[PDB]
């Protein structure tokens, strides 16, 4: 069962072709990693696969259905319902508690606050933050902040989780903790597409796509 | 006096304030560094200051004149004629030789090819590439590729040069060489605004603006 498909993706910025024609497909349950050096365009690709930015050319299919870029508000809602994001930076709202930050995507779906908070507590508890539900971002360490972002990414049980160097700001201890969380999330059936410049992290995934100068130049499959 | 000034600059992306209100000034001839880590928003700020992206709120003044971000034509004219850019990646055109790569912005400005090549040859020679004018990017090392990018940045004798972690992809030897080039360029009278996360690089500049969570939180004056 294919969960995501990108066809002939190109991205041009100021006349420069960042992505030169990329096609790929992700199957349900796969943990994919995308690596590459400077100029690879790996993050630009991730933003397009995640429906954050529209490509210059090409199409994206989510669960077999072609994405409609005309209706941007509907696309934002589709993103919120089916996809989760974990960037290098936590992007937590400073005024909101850990729990309030996690329920944001749920409220966008029109979920009652009562039930949203119950699931939010569940998610935070599973990620080891059950005792810090009312803590605001300024009261959390880097590793805890990233875990709140992960809980938020899982808010609406996404079919796909996109991660852009999720452990970039973390020390070795939190890097292992976060990767283990991702492995557990994947074991739970959630597909993951993760960009990273760390081969050691890529080696823990099912498939690694290597990019160079806006093209996928190779792939290594580890079952 | 004032070569660049930004007032109340804010940048919002998908409802999140990447830049929460920034005001700063760069004196003519000054070499300023902006340092910050993840979440600082330093690169986003650089793109706005360099006219590559528009702010959500605020104004930018170049040479005392307010920039009109709604005028694409003027914006393109300003970037090409008054500014120079050096990113972590070289962004060279693979099909073009070093000299051809350097003269592109000159030809865009209407400069005669003969005169353009004369200046391009001068710039490349000054940057230690006088014997590699006909070499294409694939024939050059990463360090040499960046020097071509610096020559291109100086093509139209910009009054202000923007650099985003220009030595991030370079080893120690090349990083030192490139920084010496920037110091030499500033010694020539060209103003430079460089974003970096390296304290060592910032220490070589006249003044440093420290950023955190989309705000300028400190300033260090060394002269
Ligand atoms: O910017 S997205 O994660 O809502």
Q: At what angle do helices B98-108 and B113-126 cross, to 10 degrees?
A: 130
The DSSP bridge partners found for residue B25 are B5
Task: Report the distance separating Cα B62 and Cα B52, nearest Å.
Answer: 14
Interface of B with A in 81-110 (CB under 8 A): 88-91, 94
Q: Which residues 6+ apart lie within 8 Å of B135 measured at CB?
A: B97, B98
Whether A216 and A7 have beta carbons less than 8 Å apart is answered as no
Give, in order, the Cα–Cα distances in Å from B37 to each of A137, A168, B211.
17, 11, 8
Give, in order, the Cα–Cα distances in Å from B104 to each of A96, B110, B120, B126.
49, 10, 10, 18
* Method by which the coordinates were obtained: X-ray
Whether A36 and A212 have beta carbons less than 8 Å apart is answered as yes
Token pair, residue A162, equals: 């996109």
Element (H, E) at B195: strand B191-196
Q: Quote the distance between the C-alpha of residue B173 and its chain's center.
A: 21
Whether A153 and A84 have beta carbons less than 8 Å apart is answered as yes
- Helix or strand or coil: residue B188? coil
Which CATH architecture fits A1-223?
3-Layer(aba) Sandwich (3.40)
Q: Which residues 6+ apart lie within 8 Å of A127 measured at CB?
A: A147, A148, A150, A151, A181
Q: Distance from A1 to chain B by nearest Cα, in Å?
A: 31
Sign of CA dihedral A13, A19, A24, A28: negative
Using the mean position of ligand 1's atoms as its centre, give its distance from the Cα of residue A150 in Å.
13
Using the mean position of ligand 1's atoms as its centre, give its distance from the Cα of residue A109 in Å.
14
Task: Report the distance separating Cα B34 and Cα A120, nearest Å.
Answer: 38
Domain boundaries, chain B: 1-223
The DSSP bridge partners found for residue B45 are none
Task: Report the distance separating Cα A91 and Cα A109, nearest Å.
Answer: 19
- Helix or strand or coil: residue B31? strand
Whether B120 and B141 have beta carbons less than 8 Å apart is answered as no
The DSSP bridge partners found for residue A32 are A193, A207
Cβ distance A89 to B169 less than 8 Å, yes or no, reads: no
Using a CB-CB cut-off of 8 Å, the residues of chain B touching A38 are 88-89, 168-169
- Helix or strand or coil: residue B187? helix
Q: Quote the distance between the C-alpha of residue A75 and its chain's center.
A: 16
Give the number of other CB atoms < 10 A from CB of residue B185.
Answer: 22
Task: Report the distance separating Cα B195 and Cα A163, nearest Å.
Answer: 25
Give, in order, the Cα–Cα distances in Å from A190 to each of A105, A149, A183.
17, 16, 10
Token pair, residue B37, equals: 């880590």
Q: Say whether residue B143 is in contact with chain A using an 8 A CB cutoff.
A: no
- Per DSSP, the residues of chain A read -EEEEEEEEEEEETTEEEEEEEEEEEETT-EEEEEE-TTS-HHHHHHHHTTSS--SEEEEEETTEEP-SS-HHHHHHHHHHHEEEE-SS----TTS-HHHHHHHHHHHTT--HHHHHHHHHHHHHHTT-TT-TT--GGGS-HHHHHHHHHHHHTTT--SEEEEESTTTT--HHHHHHHHHHHHHHHHTT-EEEEE-S-HHHHTTSSEEEEEETTEEEEEEE--
Task: Report the distance separating Cα A40 and Cα A35, nearest Å.
Answer: 8
What resolution, expressed in A, was reported for this entry? Answer: 1.7
Task: Report the distance separating Cα A2 and Cα B200, nearest Å.
Answer: 48
CB burial readout B144-159, b (16+ within 10 A) else e: bbbbbbbbbbbbbebb
Q: Say whether residue B172 is in contact with chain A using an 8 A CB cutoff.
A: no
Q: Which residue of A has its CA nearest to B72?
A: A14
The DSSP bridge partners found for residue A59 are A7
Look-up of token digits 């938020």: A152
- Helix or strand or coil: residue B4? strand
Tell me which residue of B29, B141, B148 sits closest to B87, measured CA to CA.
Answer: B148
Whether B101 and B121 have beta carbons less than 8 Å apart is answered as no
Whether B181 and B167 have beta carbons less than 8 Å apart is answered as no
Would you say A40 is a known binding-site residue?
yes
Whether B54 and B69 have beta carbons less than 8 Å apart is answered as yes
Tell me which residue of A105, A109, A110, A135 sits closest to A120, measured CA to CA.
Answer: A105
The DSSP bridge partners found for residue B9 are B22
Task: Report the distance separating Cα B95 and Cα A37, nearest Å.
Answer: 20
Which residue, judged by its Cα, is nearest atom 4 of ligand 1? B14
Whether B170 and B196 have beta carbons less than 8 Å apart is answered as no
Token pair, residue A61, equals: 């299919």
Task: Report the distance separating Cα A155 and Cα B120, nearest Å.
Answer: 55
Q: What is the DSSP letter of B207?
A: E
Give, in order, the Cα–Cα distances in Å from B164 to each of A76, B143, B203.
31, 16, 16
Backbone angles phi, psi at B205, to 5 degrees: -95, 170
Ligand 1 atom nearest to CA at A87? 3
Give, in order, the Cα–Cα distances in Å from B147 to each of A115, A121, B144.
58, 53, 5
Using a CB-CB cut-off of 8 Å, the residues of chain A touching B38 are 88-89, 168-169
CB-nearest partner of A88 from B14, B38, B94? B38
Residues having CB within 6 Å of any atom of ligand 1? A 85; B 14
Mutate to test the pocket of ligand 1, among A50, A79, A163 (most ligand atoms within 8 A of CB): A79
């Amino acid at each position: 069962a294919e969960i995501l498909r990108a066809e002939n993706i190109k991205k041009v910025i100021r006349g420069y072709e960042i992505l030169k024609g990329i096609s790929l497909s992700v199957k349900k349950g796969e943990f994919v990693s995308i690596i590459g050096a400077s100029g690879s365009g790996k993050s630009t690709l991730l933003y397009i696969l995640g429906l954050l930015d529209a490509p210059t050319e090409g199409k994206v299919f989510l669960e077999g259905k072609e994405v409609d870029y005309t209706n941007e508000k509907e696309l934002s809602l589709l993103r919120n319902r089916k996809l989760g994001f974990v960037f290098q930076f936590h992007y937590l709202i400073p005024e909101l508690t850990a729990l309030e930050n996690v329920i944001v995507p749920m409220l966008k779906m029109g979920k009652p606050k009562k039930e949203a908070k119950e699931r939010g507590e569940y998610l935070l508890s599973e990620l080891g933050l059950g005792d810090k539900l009312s803590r605001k971002p300024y009261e959390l360490s880097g590793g805890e902040q990233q875990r709140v972002a992960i809980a938020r990414a899982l808010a609406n049980e996404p079919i796909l989780l996109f991660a852009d160097e999720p452990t970039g700001n973390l020390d070795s201890a939190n890097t292992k903790r976060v990767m283990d969380i991702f492995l557990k999330i994947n074991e739970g059936g959630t597909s993951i597409v993760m960009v990273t410049h760390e081969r050691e992290l890529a080696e823990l995934t099912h498939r690694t796509l290597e990019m160079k100068d806006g093209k996928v130049v190779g792939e290594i499959t580890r079952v």
